[PDB]
């Protein structure tokens, strides 16, 4: 289920991180407003970006924290709070982390792989409750 979905995920959590980011990008093409470097790029080019690949890994590292450290699909308030916080996030809604999770969701439910995609689902869910609560709009 969820639990070892974060393991199969952190065991290739590179390229899992790259191509769910990529469904997210190529699904919703107006979310490339908070990513101006990302446009007018393939998603091979996107890969030979070193920030590309670097800093959706580290996103991918603290999202598989946050699932970790959850119960039940649920997050916890402080992790919540932290994802509201961050400067890198200033800019954004609730709707934009709905989205990523559209997008996570779907490739898992396309993925011949037994993911609990309806756990991730709920987390996701669960999540923009708990960023709502702590502040996001
Ligand atoms: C559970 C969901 C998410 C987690 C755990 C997360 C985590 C992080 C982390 C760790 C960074 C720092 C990356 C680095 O400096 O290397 C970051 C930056 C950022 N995040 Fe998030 N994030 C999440 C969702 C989102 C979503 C949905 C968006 C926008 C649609 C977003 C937009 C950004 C932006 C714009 C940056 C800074 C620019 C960049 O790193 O390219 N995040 N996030
Ligand atoms: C969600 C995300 C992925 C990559 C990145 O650079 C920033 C945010």
Redesign the pocket.
């Known amino acids: 289920g969820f639990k070892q979905d974060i393991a199969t995920l952190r065991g290739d959590l590179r390229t899992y991180a790259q191509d769910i980011f990529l469904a997210?990008l190529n699904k919703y093409p107006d979310?490339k407003r908070?990513?101006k470097?990302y446009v007018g790029k393939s998603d091979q080019e996107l890969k030979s970006m070193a920030?590309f690949g670097?800093?959706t890994e580290?996103?991918?590292?603290?999202?598989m924290?946050?699932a970790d450290r959850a119960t039940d699909c649920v997050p916890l308030a402080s992790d919540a709070s932290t994802?509201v916080q961050?400067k890198?996030?200033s800019?954004?809604t609730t709707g934009?982390?709905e989205?990523?999770f559209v997008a996570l969701v779907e490739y898992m439910r396309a993925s011949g792989q037994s993911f609990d995609s309806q756990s991730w689902d709920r987390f996701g869910k669960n999540?923009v409750s708990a960023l709502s609560s702590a502040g996001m709009k």
Do not use: P, S
């Open positions: 997210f979310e908070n990513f470097n920030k670097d800093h580290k996103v991918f590292n603290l999202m924290e946050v994802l961050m890198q996030h800019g954004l934009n982390f989205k990523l999540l």
